[PDB]
């Protein structure tokens, strides 16, 4: 029974660790699922719930009452939906003759609505699965309460060690992965929403992201973070209100409310994720975890290169052999997407490949200057692609069959589903050969991720010791040459002796 006892002990340890996982994620799941349902089913009640949650995430003091109100509102919604499911209600559609004009199925005119249009209409056909979503939300809230109660019961009843082993470093990252990486993660979330939407709203996001980048010292970020969080929550609320209540495609492009085409609300969830990260990062950014906190001698562990441990080998791989991987990724991103923006990628890759050694020899100042130049170019191309996404709506009307070179040059094509689709235009041959697989964003984003990671490496002391090693190698090269000459001389003497002996034997 010793094996059974060991399994029971492992299960108890896993359960003890869990409560900790539930504290960070339980909150993330409750904020995320309600917003997902609210965007899935637009409603006035959903709008109120979303607004309350949106305010709750950036500010902690509003969390208690918001959590209290969540279950009340969800119970109210469930009860009122079951009440209106009895269909005891028993309830102008004037089509235009010839300002917005359309011919296909709409919602104002071409369909009968039992309320007016400005409020979401709820009717339960199945009457069982049509109210399941709110029930699931209530169940999740109950689970969260149960978790808190269990924690209360366990309250009443019942880093410097990183470098020794790889498992210790793994534990440290699991504990504080977000502590030192939150800023980069929220930057990546911003580019994620920008790539996903390709609307006018994400143009606003990108302009604000460049404003964040240009103040690259972290104290300016400290000054400007609360304003960004307030802007983000107000913007999300505004977008939800706009969703609830001239070519058709162009109208779609700008985020606006049209009965015939309604801007997708599923995409918004991605924007919400960005706010969550920013809000979470902000509390950490403010908190610093100061209650934990977990050139003579600023480098306690200079000797990664020697490699006495497994973690040392992984460390040297990260701090020494990742710059060239960055260069390879830059080249791949430039070459795979044949638009004229990867030509800049190719040129940058060539120059960096040629001068990487002397760049590493340089002090951090010029290195970060050039690296910031590269990152700025990358974000510029991503913003330019999102801006030229406007040439996806007023595209068929003009660009096709005229100014074809323009489209081939900048690789104009739509990648979002909120338009017609790729791989259909080629059916008609308008003598333009639309590049369908060409335009994309994932490679630019991944290059952005690698650039930020390398920039972080440059700031770290570890690179500084590696640079010292590079200086030493640059000094040695001449001695290496002389040793090579000595080896060649020894070999040639050996061969001469063997040949002479053979000739003597022949004689
Ligand atoms: C099926 C699909 C699978 C897909 C898998 C994908 C896997 C992706 C993995 C991505 C890993 C990315 C690792 C990034 C590590 C960044 C390290 C880094 O930036 O360190 C730098 C920082 C420096 O400290 P600071 O507090 O900033 O210093 C104060 C500052 N300088 C000041 O003056 O104010 O912080 C530090 O110095 C901390 C140093 C930590 C060293 C940790 C080394 C980790 C090595 C990881 C190796 C991974 C190997 C994986 C092998 C897999 C094989 C199958
Ligand atoms: C290598 C940069 C890659 C990203 C940007 C360009 C990508 C394509 C072209 C790549 C050419 C690389 C070879 C040219 C390198 C010149 C040397 C480089 O180090 O210049 C440094 C920095 O020069 C700049 O990086 C010039 C970069 C040229 C391209 C800038 C592109 C920026 C984004 C917008 C592009 C818009 C194109 C047009 C759109 C309509 C200056 O060195 P240093 O004297 O030690 O530092 C001075 C710091 N000061 C100024 C504060 C005193």
From Swiss-Prot:
| Regions that span the bilayer | 29-40, 44-57, 72-86, 129-156, 182-197, 200-215, 229-244, 266-287, 310-336, 342-360, 374-392, 442-458
What spans does the record annotate as topological domain Cytoplasmic, numbered to this chain?
58-71, 157-181, 216-228, 288-309, 361-373
Q: What else is known?
A: Piezo comes from the Greek 'piesi' meaning pressure.
Name the family.
Belongs to the PIEZO (TC 1.A.75) family.
The record places the following residue ranges in the Extracellular compartment, namely: 41-43, 87-128, 198-199, 337-341, 393-441
Source domain of life? Eukaryota
Query: Tell me, how does this one assemble?
Result: Homotrimer; the homotrimer forms a propeller-shaped Piezo channel with a cation-ion conducting pore. Heterotrimeric interaction may occur between PIEZO1 and PIEZO2. Interacts with PKD2. Interacts with STOMl3. Interacts with TMC1, TMC2, PCDG15 and CIB2; the interaction may be part of the MET complex. Interacts with MDFIC (via C-terminus); the interaction prolongs Piezo channel inactivation. Interacts with MDFI (via C-terminus); the interaction prolongs Piezo channel inactivation.
Its tissue distribution reads: Expressed in bladder, colon, kidney and skin. Also expressed in bone marrow, liver, lung, spleen and erythrocytes (at protein level). Expressed in myoblasts (at protein level). Expressed in red blood cells. Expressed in cochlear inner and outer hair cells (IHCs and OHCs) and vestibular organ HCs.
**Lineage start:** Eukaryota, Metazoa, Chordata, Craniata, Vertebrata
Record protein name field: Piezo-type mechanosensitive ion channel component 1
The annotated phenotype of a deletion mutant is: Embryo lethality at midgestation with defects in vascular remodeling. Conditional knockout mice in inner ear hair cells show no auditory and vestibular defects.
Its function, per the record, reads: Pore-forming subunit of the mechanosensitive non-specific cation Piezo channel required for rapidly adapting mechanically activated (MA) currents and has a key role in sensing touch and tactile pain. Piezo channels are homotrimeric three-blade propeller-shaped structures that utilize a cap-motion and plug-and-latch mechanism to gate their ion-conducting pathways. Generates currents characterized by a linear current-voltage relationship that are sensitive to ruthenium red and gadolinium. Conductance to monovalent alkali ions is highest for K(+), intermediate for Na(+) and lowest for Li(+).
Name its cellular compartments.
Endoplasmic reticulum membrane; Endoplasmic reticulum-Golgi intermediate compartment membrane; Cell membrane; Cell projection, Lamellipodium membrane
């Amino acid at each position: 029974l010793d094996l059974a006892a060991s399994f029971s002990a492992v299960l108890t340890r896993i359960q003890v660790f869990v409560r900790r996982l539930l504290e960070l994620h339980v909150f993330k799941l409750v904020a995320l699922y309600t917003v997902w349902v609210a965007l899935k089913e637009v409603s006035v009640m959903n709008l109120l719930l979303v607004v309350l949650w949106a305010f709750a995430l950036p500010y902690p003091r509003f969390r208690p009452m918001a959590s209290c109100l969540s279950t009340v509102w969800t119970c109210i919604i469930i009860v009122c939906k079951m009440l209106y499911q009895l269909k005891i209600v028993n309830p102008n559609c004037t089509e235009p003759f010839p300002q917005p004009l359309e011919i296909n199925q709409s919602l104002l005119y071409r369909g009968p609505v039992d309320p007016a249009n400005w409020f979401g209409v709820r009717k339960g056909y199945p009457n069982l699965g049509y109210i399941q979503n709110h029930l699931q939300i209530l169940l999740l809230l109950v689970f969260e309460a149960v978790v808190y109660r269990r924690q209360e019961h366990y309250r009443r009843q019942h880093r410097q060690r990183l470098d020794q082993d790889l498992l210790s470093c793994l534990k440290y990252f699991i504990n504080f992965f977000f502590y030192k990486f939150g800023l980069e993660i929220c930057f990546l979330m911003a580019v994620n929403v920008i790539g996903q939407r390709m609307n006018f709203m994400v143009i606003l996001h990108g302009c604000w992201l460049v404003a964040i980048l240009t103040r690259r010292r972290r104290e300016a970020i400290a000054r400007l973070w609360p304003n960004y969080c307030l802007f983000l929550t107000l913007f999300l609320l505004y977008q939800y209100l706009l969703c609830l209540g001239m070519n058709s495609a162009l109208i779609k492009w700008l985020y606006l409310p049209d009965f015939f085409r309604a801007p997708n609300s599923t995409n918004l969830i991605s924007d919400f994720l960005l706010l969550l990260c920013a809000s979470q990062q902000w509390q950490v950014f403010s908190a610093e975890r100061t209650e934990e906190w977990q050139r003579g001698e600023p480098n306690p562990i200079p000797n990664f290169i020697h490699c006495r441990s497994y973690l040392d080998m992984l460390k040297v791989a990260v701090f020494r052999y990742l710059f060239w991987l960055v260069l390879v990724v830059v080249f791949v991103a430039g070459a795979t997407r044949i638009s004229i923006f990867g030509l800049g990628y190719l040129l940058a890759c060539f120059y960096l490949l040629l001068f990487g050694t002397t760049l590493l020899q340089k002090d951090t100042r010029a290195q970060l200057v050039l690296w910031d130049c590269l990152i700025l170019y990358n974000v510029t191309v991503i913003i330019s692609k999102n801006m030229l996404s406007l040439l996806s709506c007023v595209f068929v009307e003009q660009m096709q069959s005229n100014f074809c070179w323009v489209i081939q040059l900048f690789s104009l094509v739509c990648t979002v589903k909120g338009y017609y689709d790729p791989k259909e235009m080629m059916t008609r041959d308008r003598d333009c050969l639309l590049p369908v697989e060409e335009a994309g964003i994932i490679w630019d984003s991944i290059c952005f991720f690698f650039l930020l990671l390398q920039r972080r490496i440059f700031l770290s002391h570890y690179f500084l010791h590696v640079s010292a090693d590079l200086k030493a190698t640059a000094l040695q090269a001449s001695r290496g040459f002389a040793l090579y000459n000595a080896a060649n001389l020894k070999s040639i003497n050996f061969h001469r002796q063997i040949e002479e002996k053979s000739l003597a034997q022949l004689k």
